[PDB]
From a paper:
This in turn initiates a cascade of signal transduction pathways leading to different cellular responses including cell-cycle arrest and apoptosis that are known to prevent cancer development (1–4). p53 binds as a tetramer to specific response elements consisting mainly of two decameric half-sites separated by a variable number of base pairs. The majority of tumor-related p53 mutations, particularly those defined as mutational ‘hotspots’, occur within the DNA-binding core domain of p53 (10). R273, a DNA-contact amino acid, is one of the most frequently altered residues in human cancer (6.4% of all somatic mutations), with mutations to histidine (46.6%) and to cysteine (39.1%) being most common.
In the case of R273H and R273C, it was shown that the replacement of threonine by arginine at position 284 (T284R) restores activity to both p53 mutants. Crystal structures of p53 rescued proteins in complexes with DNA were obtained for three double mutants: R273H/T284R, R273C/T284R and R273C/S240R. The crystal structures of R273H/T284R-DNA and R273C/S240R-DNA (space group C2) are similar to that of type II complexes with contiguous half-sites. In the second case, two bases at the 3′-end of each strand (C-G) are extra-helical and the 5′-terminal C base of a symmetry-related strand completes the consensus half-site to form a contiguous 20-bp binding site. The loss of protein–DNA contacts as a result of the primary mutations, R273H or R273C, is compensated for by a new interaction between the side chain of T284R with the same DNA phosphate oxygen shown to interact with R273 in the wt p53-DNA complex. In the two rescued complexes, the arginine side chains of the suppressor mutations, T284R and S240R, protrude from opposite directions toward the DNA, each forming a single interaction with the same phosphate group, but with different non-esterified oxygen atoms. The directed interactions of the R273 amino acids with the DNA backbone appear to support the local constriction of the double helix prompted by the two Hoogsteen base pairs, whereas the weaker interactions via T284R or S240R appear incapable of supporting this change, thus retaining a continuously regular double helix with Watson–Crick base pairs. In type II complexes of R273H/T284R and R273C/S240R, R248 side chains form direct or water-mediated H-bonds with the adenine N3 atoms, respectively.
Residue numbers in the entry:
A (entry chain A), B (entry chain A): 94 to 182, 186 to 293
Write the structure that this text describes.
DNA sequence: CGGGCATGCCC
DNA sequence: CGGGCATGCCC
């Protein structure tokens, strides 16, 4: 078992928050976000855009880290890993990592030598002029249902904004359900919330 | 892809056939056999008794081999293997083999150097006096549904009676569905046969 | 594309 | 134990 990183929202002195794109209505849309549930529903190994918004400009050398943790108390201490099947199936990501970043030449994949937890880090880049946010494309390389991996257990993705010195500048999180039919599953979960939540 | 061993029934000069035990009615009975479907429904890593019946006594040194093949034409050439998850989960069986034999001190596990197919072999032993058959206890170490293994594809188990020289004395086969609820699944499949087969 | 099934497992 | 759900995928 491994010590558990904080998932406590900390928007901090830079006013850090996440944003997500609206999606179509398809049963099998590739990625769709539920504001009511703060939960992303997406397909495995498909683009998941996450926007970074800040009110104040982070210092040069700021980094953006993503890490998965199991949401439920009883699974929090277990490291989130790729299942053995998909592990055995891009040149930089270790096969065991669940979360990848696409289209970034400065991506780093880390394995914590104490907690054994995986994370993926890219440099923070400010928005282009006239733009309000910066977008990172994440991929999740297993379904939430994968036998021997997540095994139908919900996870959070924790996004931390960190300075080059390691100071925590901001932290936000969202739940993720990686699945074959993100539209179906989002709509059922939202209905279940309203009907019996 | 690998060449495909025969599944053609050959009861042969010794009158070789298989027998199976009757089971209870439970939804999750450990092992149950459908004569109408020539199909065993069983749970993973649980005892599956198979009886060997002969009309004439096989010669000394006769062996009994079990091997799995995919039943459907489109999958026949693929070697049946343990899924990566269960492979990574008795002292003699290689982790990759689907079929094991329990309670036999002369069991051999083989990996064919040409076809790459797995088989498990035990000596043939004649029934005790007053007994009509000899029983072997097999185990299947994945569910039929296992991602990265059988993946919901049906298999046959082929049992061959072979002399010590390698001559084929007899061959029989039965379909297998390894699953959580053998009673449920047998009853549904038998109903489907009657209703729309 | 959206309807619908099989199947491990609910806690 | 038997009812029933979530979820990958039907070919
Ligand atoms: Zn997986
Ligand atoms: Zn398996």
């Amino acid at each position: 078992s491994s010590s558990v990183p904080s998932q406590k929202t900390y928007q901090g002195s830079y006013g850090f928050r996440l944003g997500f794109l609206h999606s179509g209505t398809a049963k099998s849309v590739t990625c769709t976000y539920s504001p009511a549930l703060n939960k992303m529903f997406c397909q495995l190994a498909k683009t998941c855009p996450v926007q970074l918004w800040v009110d104040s400009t982070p210092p040069p050398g700021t980094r953006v880290r993503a890490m998965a943790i199991y949401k439920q108390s009883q699974h929090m201490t277990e490291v989130v890993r790729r299942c053995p099947h998909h592990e055995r199936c891009d040149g930089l990501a270790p096969p065991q990592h669940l979360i990848r970043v696409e289209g970034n030449l400065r991506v780093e994949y880390l394995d914590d030598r104490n907690t054994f937890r995986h994370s993926v880090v890219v440099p923070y880049e400010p928005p282009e002029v006239g733009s309000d946010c910066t977008t990172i494309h994440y991929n999740y390389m297993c379904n939430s249902s994968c036998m021997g991996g997540m095994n139908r257990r919900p996870i959070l993705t924790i996004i931390t904004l960190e300075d080059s010195s390691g100071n925590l500048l901001g932290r936000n999180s969202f739940e993720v359900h990686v699945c074959a039919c993100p539209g179906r599953d989002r709509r059922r979960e939202e209905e279940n919330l309203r009907k019996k939540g």
